[PDB]
Design a protein around this ligand. Structure first.
Ligand SMILES: *Cc1cc2c(cc1C)nc1c(=O)[nH]c(=O)nc-1n2C[C@H](O)[C@H](O)[C@H](O)COP(=O)(O)OP(=O)(O)OC[C@H]1O[C@@H](n2cnc3c(N)ncnc32)[C@H](O)[C@@H]1O
Ligand SMILES: *Cc1cc2c(cc1C)nc1c(=O)[nH]c(=O)nc-1n2C[C@H](O)[C@H](O)[C@H](O)COP(=O)(O)OP(=O)(O)OC[C@H]1O[C@@H](n2cnc3c(N)ncnc32)[C@H](O)[C@@H]1O
Ligand SMILES: *Cc1cc2c(cc1C)nc1c(=O)[nH]c(=O)nc-1n2C[C@H](O)[C@H](O)[C@H](O)COP(=O)(O)OP(=O)(O)OC[C@H]1O[C@@H](n2cnc3c(N)ncnc32)[C@H](O)[C@@H]1O
Ligand SMILES: [Cl-]
Ligand SMILES: [Cl-]
Lengths: 526, 528, 527, 77
């Protein structure tokens, strides 16, 4: 490779990248989807949780997660081991990869991470796809929310009926309804958490689930009505986009590092789109000499509480593969001492954000870096709780980029200055009081340190936002307009939670995909 | 539903693919089946080849953890002393590879497998030494060096990958001086041979193409027309559950497609099981094929491991390369310097001391990626070197894996149960292994003083070098499952592959060896 | 009371304090022994390891140790929890007690600790009393070493014969002699480590040991030849000496805080002695406006390696051979046996290899009770042997403790702040120490594979063998605080005691040595 | 270490009932209400072990009460 072009170029094959490609190609455009990562499946950006084994052991998929997530700024500044042989060589403040000696740990965002793969995080994510609360979460310069959301949910294959038939789901909902005692807004009750996923129909494999990966989003535009691959879409793994080259607000081409074969590549296009997620997107701009005042400012995520509980005996008391007995792992004299149907769909509930409740509760079981259930414990016993609270978007919170240090892609090393705003503090605490009461209503806590109730360290949410936020005017408070287009540029657009300018509690991916579709229409129109 | 080829190979591990390579290349038609998914565009590509792993080695351990799955998890008596009594509890879960019949004290805790197109061969550290003529090989195999040669070609074995390592030199100097020509000069301190090769692609010379099963298959996957070769077919996500057989001729394989979820029957002239140490016997056990020796003579390597921080003296001695046309690859510019005084693209030290006279153990002085001894994310891993000694485990019938009749694993197949202990005889030598490993470490610096990097014996299983379960012999003695052509006693057309076949205690990394014996079996199949 | 006086006043009832009292009182002087700590036994400064239970469970006495040791500078400057409820209150850099926001952790001495008790550390210590190597460890301006050492050993009840009869002791010594292969100087062989202790004689209680506490040192002078208490000695627990008041090089009195009843006390004396150990001694001076240039400089200890091993099967095989009139003392009868094949009353292996030519480090192969490497409660500690090597730390002026003017410790005295790093010169030998320690361990078995028992260097302070802070010299020129009579430059009647006095890098357990130099100073005072 | 949690059994150090009291030599008690051992003239017990009744409070003061009681019983005769 060396020099090539398409109508449109999309940096990042995350969920959001693929959304653009889907919409754009489907409406007659030709695009190149670029990612710095490798493809980890026969087809690009397949969801890795779909594999048989993960259908059988959920908790194991956390190992794929840990393999996908890569810390962005690791403080190295003062590391000194008090008990190392003095004959041995040591040096503090390494700079290698995402090591950063200029990072103060105390203003850091420790679990600010990214994934570099064809699919981004969308090949490991837990697929939770809620909509923003009309009053508390949405902003109103976007006029056609429910249209975009609808179109996004179609692409993501959103569904609420996946865990509908859960026995544990019922048992819990009953106890929670009783706990709250009609004090929730009846418009936002305890209810089934909507997910980009769907129960399979393939014989007894209805016991299993097809989670949505970016693949699923691309699939309809990947081949023509001739089963030949579609020329209008091309996917380029292992291509680090380093620089956008631009003259007077028009972007000409992209400077890209092919990592195998290791060669420079120039990519010319009529339109450029960066969906490299919260931190890497601004990084690319910063490194392309494009620095609006608001870039990487108004850094925001969700403050989170988390905890796990063991189901009450009361609940257990109260509670697919008929043609394959061996799928229950017992025969003859051996029985399963756990009294919970092995193929009981996982409890997957949410309480929305609502009046008096600026936070988003999930009562479920999924796979994350933290609170992995032990190997030797039947994970039917446990339920995970994850509350997500409002983080106010403020300019004194930011990621910046060192001029003299570089990351693993050889691009300006990110440095965080972040603290949770004092205003959101009292609501965060309320979040906790809430999460606890709810947990203890459906059983006792899993008494491991790892499952204790607790606030996560900043970054843990993986719901970073505001870094390339939108506004109505080139106010200096925003990077993009409401068509997700960069102030002062003809043909450069961004995608991802980074665009969101408005504190919220909900899982932002679906939202982001909406705004992308919007930008995509704006691109189609002219 | 129902399909056939000349030959069927269960397991697309390195050994599976070796069979396919040789068999297809010599005109046979093959179906390669695996219970796992394919983790790359092409089947069984090595995942360490990705750019990022070339930049951060330590990180690849996370892929490893994602590949390895414990086989018998004792659940029998788990009780939490501090749990709300309102909350429900029951010990001895049976779900997946949980096993209430497993005594922890005779267990092999880190007996694990990988279920992927490629098996462990898409994560492994690619070390391909040969067995010591006298101490490790056995005599009933006549043509060792021919097979080994043919295997090394397929694996793309190379010794020149880390040859130009500056740390590699600095260490070798200190170690040569430590040992003081006590080592047999036929087996000196030397570059560890690896299924890998330095890239040639411009500045990407600074990076490495590790060998995956893919690399082995590549030549036979398309014809001399770049159209895909009909003589090979690859089936991910197909759990082979039962081999159906009469009076020693195997008719077909009963297989679970997991997507779409449907039963499949696979008919073939010849069947080969390369499902690795434990899953291979499992398949037989479940097919009513139980020679006396099945899953007996369970054996691995007892291991010592430890990590050290390089002496100041060594670091001083190294101040001198790659990526000259890309300054930003060193992560600094202008006033910022890298405070680590070790060339960032200095090839990793990758040395071995063979097994030799008076030394029944195999030393590696290197840096690679395993579940254990991962270097912290806040420490520049140029500071560290990993040590891994592998000792002889004597093959004994009182050590075994067996298979419960009333419990099943994650594939719904008989739950494995281990009864394993290191033989008393190998005890003296194991301890000598340690004394050796430490002295060597302390000669090239001090220990990394983390708990995780302390010098220590690994718990059984950690080696991932399990052997003897379906071992070979000269006769249907009751002491072996297969003959020297890796063919199962009492069967016309059933063969096994993998370290499980090895009947002879050793210290070295067995994969290359196993691939040899496969080629042998493959010739026996071609020439019969 | 408010004002009291005696001929002599001794600050600190540590081993060294008591040594002065012993010698001084015994030669007709009258003394007040003051300590900021409480008395933890009927009699002052009894060793707490003497209790029956500790005779039965050694491992458990580590809990007394942990209770005795108090860190001196705890860095607070930047403590931030990443995962605390934001509604909740936080503030970094607390100053309370021995919290110190001005302490850089990276130049700190983390396990610089003291004990505050009638007895100091001498009521928990492991009682090892070796002498310094003539050539490699002693200094020459002290003329009468062997006389002082002899007198000190008598007071401490030093003995080598306590673990003489150890079966494990033999089994090990055999393997080690074979390992070393007569490479050692024959003047300093593998041998029984000398200890301030002695086997009891009291019937079957000969199976047990009387470890030496400061008590044991004082005992002979505490009562007259009438069993009535000796007026010439008085002990004051719970009296924090805060300030020495002095005019033109003569010390007049000591300003002391009684903590119960809480009242100021002034203590007048002809002679003053500070044996408040390495850090608190200089602290008292610093706070008394006495600041020689060398004070708290030349801070020095031992760099240490440590590790534990489980005995080889070979060794255990080689042994299967007290309390004959008490079967139940073996914890079994009839059909129940002890599955551990190691005589329950086999004296503990207590060996050392001295410092010698080519070996500037002091090895102990033993089992004793420390903050670290405590053997788990579910493991029979007969299985294990502890290794502790002590290496030379060069005395350097760029290593020091200093004292903040605007922060105070738990006694309300200037907060100590450390600036300490192991000297580059001693680095190569430290590493040799390790190579040595390991080889030795692996010759007598395999490592106890717990994290806690892995072979390792201790963090600075762990030795508890701090030295050089108030070091001696020959003249007020080359920077020292005291002369060779342990007397402070430019003062008539002020003396110091303790390892702080030692000006000379060494590897051995310094307490016995310190007691020598004290006796010396004491004679100087008697003359 | 400071998370909310149930302690493992024993952690309370408030053990009771082992030598509990009753009204009669019922086989359900060791001591009588004067903390005296059934079938003995002159042997008494003291401590939370005497308490026969589930409770939540810190038992030491209680135990001291019952002791004073037993002590009076001893004085009185
Ligand atoms: C890890 C994770 C995330 C997650 C989740 C659970 C886990 C374990 N659960 C979620 C949930 O329940 N609901 C939800 O809404 N989100 C959840 N998430 C997060 C979700 O995965 C992210 O919100 C989403 O993946 C972000 O999508 P976006 O398209 O913004 O892209 P990305 O996947 O973060 O990464 C995009 C790609 O950009 C490529 N890249 C980056 N830098 C470059 C450069 N310089 N050049 C070229 N390509 C680049 C990356 O490789 C990545 O593929
Ligand atoms: C994990 C690992 C392994 C490793 C290593 C480092 C790590 C981190 N370093 C090595 C080294 O330096 N040198 C060496 O020689 N080996 C090293 N290894 C191990 C090496 O990868 C293995 O020894 C080798 O891969 C074994 O090859 P084999 O072909 O024997 O098979 P496998 O890779 O173990 O897995 C075989 C496949 O069989 C499939 N399978 C299993 N059961 C079934 C059933 N019932 N049905 C269908 N398919 C089945 C598995 O899915 C697997 O893919
Ligand atoms: C803790 C320990 C120490 C130890 C050891 C094992 C353990 C677990 N093993 C040793 C060994 O085997 N051999 C050896 O030579 N030393 C060993 N040690 C150390 C040894 O115990 C000490 O070096 C020795 O105790 C030093 O004695 P010194 O007389 O210098 O005094 P101290 O015991 O350290 O305590 C001094 C007293 O001073 C009082 N004090 C301090 N400041 C004041 C003020 N301002 N006012 C009044 N009193 C004060 C302290 O309370 C203490 O009592
Ligand atoms: Cl042979
Ligand atoms: Cl405990």
């Amino acid at each position: 490779s060396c020099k090539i072009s398409a109508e449109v170029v999309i940096i990042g094959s995350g969920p959001v990248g693929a959304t653009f490609a889907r919409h754009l190609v489907e409406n007659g455009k030709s695009v190149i989807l670029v990612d710095a990562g490798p493809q980890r499946s026969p087809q690009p950006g397949e969801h890795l949780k779909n594999a048989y084994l993960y259908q059988k052991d959920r908790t194991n998929f956390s190992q794929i997660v840990n393999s996908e997530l890569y810390k962005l700024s690791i403080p190295t500044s003062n590391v000194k081991l008090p008990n190392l042989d003095p004959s041995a060589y040591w040096a503090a403040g390494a700079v290698r990869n995402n090591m950063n000696p200029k990072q103060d740990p105390n203003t850091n965002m420790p679990y600010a991470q990214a994934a570099f793969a064809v699919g981004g995080m969308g090949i490991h994510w837990t697929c939770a796809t809620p909509r923003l609360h009309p009053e508390l979460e949405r902003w109103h310069y976007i006029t056609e929310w429910d249209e975009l959301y609808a179109q996004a949910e179609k692409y993501f294959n959103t569904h609420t009926n996946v865990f509908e038939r859960s026995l544990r789901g019922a048992a819990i909902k009953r106890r929670l309804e009783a706990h709250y005692n009609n004090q929730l807004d009846p418009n936002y009750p305890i209810q089934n958490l909507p997910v980009a996923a769907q129960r399979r129909e393939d014989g007894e494999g209805e016991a299993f689930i097809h989670w949505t990966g970016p693949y699923d989003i691309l699939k309809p535009v990947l081949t023509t009505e001739e089963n030949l691959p579609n020329p209008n879409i091309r996917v380029l793994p292992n291509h680090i986009v380093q620089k956008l080259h631009h003259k007077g607000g028009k972007v000409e081409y992209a400077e890209v590092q092919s990592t195998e074969p290791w060669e420079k590549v120039e990519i010319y296009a009529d339109i450029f789109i960066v969906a490299a997620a919260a931190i890497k997107t601004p990084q690319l701009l910063w490194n392309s000499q494009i620095r609006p005042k608001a870039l990487g400012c108004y850094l925001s995520e969700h403050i989170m509480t988390f905890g796990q509980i063991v189901l009450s005996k009361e609940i257990v008391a109260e509670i697919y593969f008929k043609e394959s007995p061996k799928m229950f792992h017992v025969a003859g004299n051996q029985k399963d001492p756990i009294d919970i149907p092995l193929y009981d769909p996982d409890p997957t509930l949410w309480i929305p954000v609502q009046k008096d409740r600026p936070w988003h509760c999930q009562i479920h079981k999924d796979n994350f870096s933290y609170g992995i259930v032990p190997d030797n414990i039947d994970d039917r016993l446990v339920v995970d709780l994850r509350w997500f609270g409002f983080v106010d978007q403020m300019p004194t919170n930011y990621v910046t980029f060192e001029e003299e240090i570089f990351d693993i892609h050889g691009m300006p090393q990110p440095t965080f200055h972040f603290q949770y705003p004092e205003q959101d503090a009292e609501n965060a605490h309320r979040m906790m009081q809430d999460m606890t009461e709810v947990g203890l209503s459906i059983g006792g806590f899993l008494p491991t340190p790892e499952a204790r109730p607790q606030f996560m360290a900043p970054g843990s949410s993986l719901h970073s936002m505001g870094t390339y936020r939108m506004g109505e005017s080139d106010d200096g408070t925003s990077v993009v307009d409401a068509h997700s287009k960069v102030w002062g540029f003809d043909n450069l657009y961004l995608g991802g939670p980074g665009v969101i300018p408005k504190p919220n509690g909900a899982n932002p991916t679906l939202t982001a995909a909406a705004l992308a579709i919007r930008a995509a229409n704006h691109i189609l129109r002219n």
